[PDB]
Design a protein around this ligand. Sequence first.
Ligand SMILES: [Zn+2]
Ligand SMILES: [Zn+2]
Lengths: 187, 187
Amino acid sequence: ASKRALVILAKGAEEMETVIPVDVMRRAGIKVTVAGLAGKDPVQCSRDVVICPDASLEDAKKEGPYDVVVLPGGNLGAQNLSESAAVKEILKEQENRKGLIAAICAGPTALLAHEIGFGSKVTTHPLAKDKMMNGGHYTYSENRVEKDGLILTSRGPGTSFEFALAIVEALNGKEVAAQVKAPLVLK
Amino acid sequence: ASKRALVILAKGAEEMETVIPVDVMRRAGIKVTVAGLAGKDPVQCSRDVVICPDASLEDAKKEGPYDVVVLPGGNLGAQNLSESAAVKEILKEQENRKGLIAAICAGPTALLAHEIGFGSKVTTHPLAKDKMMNGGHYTYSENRVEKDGLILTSRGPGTSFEFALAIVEALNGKEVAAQVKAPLVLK
Ligand SMILES: [Zn+2]
Ligand SMILES: [Zn+2]
C-alpha cells in the first residue's frame, strides 16, 4: 500500500523546491500527484520553468486523502497558496486527520495564512522569517529541516534534498531514505 | 551583453539535473533556452515531471551560438541525446568555436557518442563510468565537479547545485557565483 503525496503547484512556485521533492518522493516509491492550483494547465514557475501538472487541485482533492501535503516555496507561489480557499480546506482537513504537512522556504507562510499548526516549531527561508513570525504563533528555528510532529518545514532550494528525504523518512522509514539517498551523490 | 545557455531536454532526462541548472543560471542573469530535442512539445522526464520547453532544438539552434551548451543526465535522456544527429552538430560546432560544454551524471556519455572532448578529464555518475570510459578516450575523475578547460562535467542530482554554480563562475565570474549562492541556503 504505497504512501501518497499531494504537491500543490501555483504560479510563481520555486521550481527546484517543487521538482526535487517530487522526484525524490517518486524514487522512494511514493505515489505523487502534482496538482495545479489554477487548473490542469501548465504552470510558470518563479524562474520561468514551465511544469505541466498531473491534475487540477480540484480533481486531486477528490482522490485524497494523502499521507503528506507538500507546499513548495517561491514568494509568489506561496502567496497564491496563502490566498486560496481550496488550499485552506485541504490543509485543515489534513491537520484534522493528523496527516503530515510539509512546507519549504516561503511555503510555510501559507500555514500562517490558513492558521495551520500554531504552536509548532518551524523554519523558513531567512527572508520569510518576519512574515511567518507575525503574531508569534510559531516558534522559530534555524535548523535546515525542522519537524515538530506533523508539521515539517525547511529553508530553501539548497535544503530541498534534506527536506525531501525527511518526508521520505517520515512516510517510508529511515532505511528507505538511506537507500534513496545513496544514488543521488549528495555530499 | 548577457551570456546565453542552451539546455537540451530529451525524454527521460533527470528533471532535477535539468531544473537546478536552468534556475541557478537564470538567477545569475544568464539567458537560458530550454530546448526540446523532439520539438516544442512537453517532455516527460525520468521521474515523470513534465516540462514544457521554451523552443524546439531546431529553432533554438537558429538563435545560437551559446556561451554554454548543457546536457542533463538521466540514462534514457542521455541515450536520446547520444543518438541525435542534431545534438552531434551542435556539440561539434560548440567545440570548434571553443565554447563551453557542460554535462552532468549520464550526460557526459553523449560526449563520448559524439566524439567530443577526447583527452579531457571527466566525471560522471558512478554507474555511468564504464560506459564513459569505453576505449579510454577520457581520463576519469571522482571530483564532484570536474573542469578540464571547456569540458565541464559532474556526477548526479546531488552535485547539480555545484555543477550549476561552476557554470555560473565560468561565464559570469566568482563574485556573481557567490552572490547567487548565498540566497540558496546551501550547506
Ligand atoms: Zn525558495
Ligand atoms: Zn542522474
